[PDB]
A paper describes a structure:
CRL2FEM1B is an oligomeric E3 ubiquitin ligase composed of CUL2, FEM1B, ELOB, ELOC, and RBX1. FEM1B is the substrate recognition protein of the oligomeric CRL2FEM1B E3 ubiquitin ligase that has been implicated in sex determination, apoptosis, colon cancer and Alzheimer’s disease. Cullin-RING E3 ubiquitin ligases (CRLs) are multi-subunit complexes composed of a catalytic Ring-finger protein, a cullin scaffold protein, substrate adapter proteins, and a substrate recognition protein. Here, we describe for the first time the cryo-EM structures of oligomeric CRL2FEM1B in three different states as follows: unneddylated CRL2FEM1B, dimeric neddylated CRL2FEM1B complexed with BEX2, and monomeric neddylated CRL2FEM1B complexed with FNIP1/FLCN.
To investigate the structural basis of ubiquitylation of BEX2 by neddylated CRL2FEM1B, we determined the cryo-EM structure of N8-CRL2FEM1B complexed with MBP-BEX2. The ‘forceps’-like conformation formed by C-terminal WHB domain of CUL2 and RBX1 in protomer 1 interacted with the cullin repeat 3 of CUL2 in protomer 2, while the N-terminal domain α-helix of FEM1B (residues 269–284) in protomer 1 interacted with the C-terminal domain ankyrin repeats (residues 546–588) of FEM1B in protomer 2. According to the results of 3D variability analysis, the catalytic domain of protomer 2 was moving up and down around the substrate recognition domain of protomer 1, allowing it to adjust the distance between E2~Ub and substrates. Under this circumstance, we believe that FEM1B of protomer 1 serves as the only substrate recognition domain in this complex while RBX1 and NEDD8 of protomer 2 act as the only catalytic domain, because RBX1 of protomer 1 and FEM1B of protomer 2 are occluded. This asymmetric dimeric conformation provides a much closer catalytic domain to substrates, comparing to monomeric CRL2FEM1B. The in vitro ubiquitylation experiments revealed that oligomerization-deficient mutants except FEM1BF549T had significantly lower ubiquitylation activities toward BEX2 than wild-type N8-CRL2FEM1B, whereas these mutants did not affect the ubiquitylation of FNIP1/FLCN significantly.
Residue numbers in the entry:
A (entry chain F): 189 to 376
B (entry chain A): 283 to 379, 386 to 401, 407 to 426, 428 to 494, 506 to 520, 528 to 567, 576 to 590, 597 to 622, ...
C (entry chain R): 25 to 36
């Protein structure tokens, strides 16, 4: 940079000419092809933990040798080569992780799909489908004396249990609030 | 002093009116009486370590209330200010730094073996519980509730329902929503047995969902074992029928009754038994220890012979688990509460956040400073919190 | 005789 520092316009062009292009392309190629082995290796959850751990290190690695005006572009392609390649596999197997819940799994899952574009919409409807199951359950087969009391004593718990998770495991998001409301506007 | 350290009721009976008339006179006597209240309760309650010790503790807490209510309602006309002193003193004689666990032991002994006597004695119990500051009482109780429900040891159903009915009033449906499910099952289980008896003794209990804290097959059994799925063919669907072989038991005609050593006797009474384990050999070794215990002539690796020398009828780790089993839910609820509170206000002080979360979640758990200290670690791990770097006291919305 | 059986309905 220093040699063309006093070159009034185009301050950083030579840096792009001699360094930026090969360091971008070859490193991206290697980092993308390395993930294929780990994809072949282990489970989807294990793979997600792997990719998160690898994503954590590259930020610290990056700051050691670059200008401040290049923090954003590298991680963009680094993300794409990691997630957009297997977006199909990630959208698949969303079941059995929302049909039950070990909150670590989709807790890891949320950020990756929030980063990549168009990933989120599927999970919204996926959660909405599972919401109804409770409410279509434990509310039917209820015909007895003082039956109005039990109905209201069962509607509220669906809101109560499901608000905590959507406000704890996954940071609060108005989109997720919209799913719960629509599901609750069709159980009573 | 010397008029409240003892009591000739005429003296402070005269005293009360004069200080009620003049301003600012009353506050001193409130704290003065409060100081003397503790002395009893810090006395005659200590130096009490013996057998049946939970009974004596509750048989000593109540008398402090009993004696001191009469005087504050007779010598001195009833005054809510004086009521406040007694309560505060009583909210610090049984919550100092075991008793919350002792209360469950108290309830355990009474119900287990007159009904009016039982009700009268249980009436006094509800008073003490209101002063306890409760997670252990909410969780620890179901454990010996289960052992009374099953393996026999079940008392008059009326008393079981009365305990629930009285406890539900104090804290509503929220506190005791679950336990209403357990007792209803046994009435249904008996009715459930009656209908499927016609499909033909084998009697069977069902358990509701997984809310209960409760947690090779014999060659002659399959005919009835797989016949039970005809009950699914009848009225059930998609439920995983769970033959939980660990805890269950049964009176069977071997020619005791817990399935561990009945599974042993399935080959004993009749390598080959090692294959029949269908489990790790350490558990079977425990079951052979059960044999070695009393009156059972093994050739002993697992080499066995018979004993011709033949009743006719055949733990700290628990609370160690319970100490942190509740604590996990405490950490989860602390994370929840943190998210809700700092995402709602967005401009509050973080020490004021500590106080506000203390106020909001006081009923759920007893607040602790260190847990609040360690809240931000996981949030900053994913950088979930938009942690206000200008002032950590002030906030910014996470999105 | 009488096997004492208990089984929980799970994932109805």
């Amino acid at each position: 940079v220093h040699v063309e520092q006093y070159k009034k316009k185009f301050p950083l062009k030579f840096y792009q000419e001699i360094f930026e292009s090969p360091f971008l392309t070859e490193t991206g190629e290697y980092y993308k092809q390395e993930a294929s082995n780990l994809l072949q290796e282990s489970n989807c959850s294990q793979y997600m933990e792997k990719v998160l751990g690898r994503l954590k290190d590259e930020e610290i690695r990056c700051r050691k040798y670059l200008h401040p005006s290049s923090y954003t572009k590298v991680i963009h392609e680094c993300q794409q080569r990691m997630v957009a390649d297997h977006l199909q596999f990630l959208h698949a197997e969303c079941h059995n992780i929302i049909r039950q819940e070990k909150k670590n799994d989709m807790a890891n899952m949320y950020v990756l799909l929030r980063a990549v574009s168009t990933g989120l919409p599927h999970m919204i409807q996926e959660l909405q489908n599972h919401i109804h199951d409770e409410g279509l359950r434990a509310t039917s087969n209820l015909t007895q004396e003082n039956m109005p009391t039990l109905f209201v004593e069962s509607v509220l718990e669906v809101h109560g249990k499901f608000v905590q998770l959507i406000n704890t495991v996954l940071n609060g998001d108005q989109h997720f609030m919209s799913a719960l409301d629509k599901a609750l506007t069709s159980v009573v | 002093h010397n008029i409240i350290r003892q009591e000739k009721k005429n003296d402070m009976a005269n005293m009360y009116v004069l200080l009620r008339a003049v301003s600012t006179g009353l506050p001193h006597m409130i704290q003065e009486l409060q100081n003397h209240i503790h002395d009893e309760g810090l006395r005659a309650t200590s130096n009490l370590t013996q057998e049946n010790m939970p009974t004596l503790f509750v048989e000593s807490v109540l008398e402090v209330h009993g004696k001191f209510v009469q005087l504050i309602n007779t010598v001195l006309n009833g005054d809510q200010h004086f009521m406040s002193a007694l309560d505060k003193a009583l909210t610090s004689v049984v919550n100092y730094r075991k008793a919350p666990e002792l209360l469950a032991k108290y309830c355990d002994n009474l119900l287990k073996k007159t009904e009016n006597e039982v009700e009268d004695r249980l009436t006094s119990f509800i008073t003490v519980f209101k002063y306890i500051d409760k997670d252990v009482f909410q969780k620890f109780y179901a454990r010996m509730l289960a052992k009374r429900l099953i393996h026999g040891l079940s008392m008059s159903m009326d008393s079981e329902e009365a305990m629930i009915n009285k406890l539900k009033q104090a804290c509503g449906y929220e506190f005791t929503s679950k336990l209403h499910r357990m007792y209803t099952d046994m009435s249904v289980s008996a009715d459930l047995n009656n209908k499927f008896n016609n499909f033909i003794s084998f009697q069977i209990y069902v358990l509701q969902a997984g809310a209960w804290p409760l947690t090779a097959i014999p060659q002659e059994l399959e005919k009835s074992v797989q016949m039970f799925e005809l009950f699914y063919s009848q009225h059930f669907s998609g439920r995983k029928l769970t033959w939980l072989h660990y805890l269950c038991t049964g009176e069977v005609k071997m020619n005791m009754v817990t399935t561990y050593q009945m599974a042993v006797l399935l080959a004993f009474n009749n390598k080959e038994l090692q294959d029949s384990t269908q489990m790790n050999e350490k558990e079977l070794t425990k079951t052979i220890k059960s044999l070695l215990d009393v009156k059972m002539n093994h050739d002993s690796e697992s080499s066995f012979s018979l004993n011709m020398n033949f009743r006719t009828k055949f733990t700290p780790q628990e609370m160690e688990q319970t100490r942190s089993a509740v604590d996990e839910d405490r950490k989860m609820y602390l994370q929840a509460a943190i998210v809700r509170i700092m995402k709602a206000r967005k401009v509050l002080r973080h020490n004021a956040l500590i106080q506000e979360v203390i106020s909001q979640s006081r009923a759920r758990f007893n607040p602790s400073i260190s847990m609040i200290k360690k809240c931000i670690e996981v949030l900053i791990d994913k950088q979930y919190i938009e942690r206000s770097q200008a002032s950590a006291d002030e906030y910014s919305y996470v999105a | 005789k009488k096997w004492n059986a208990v089984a929980l309905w799970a994932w109805d």
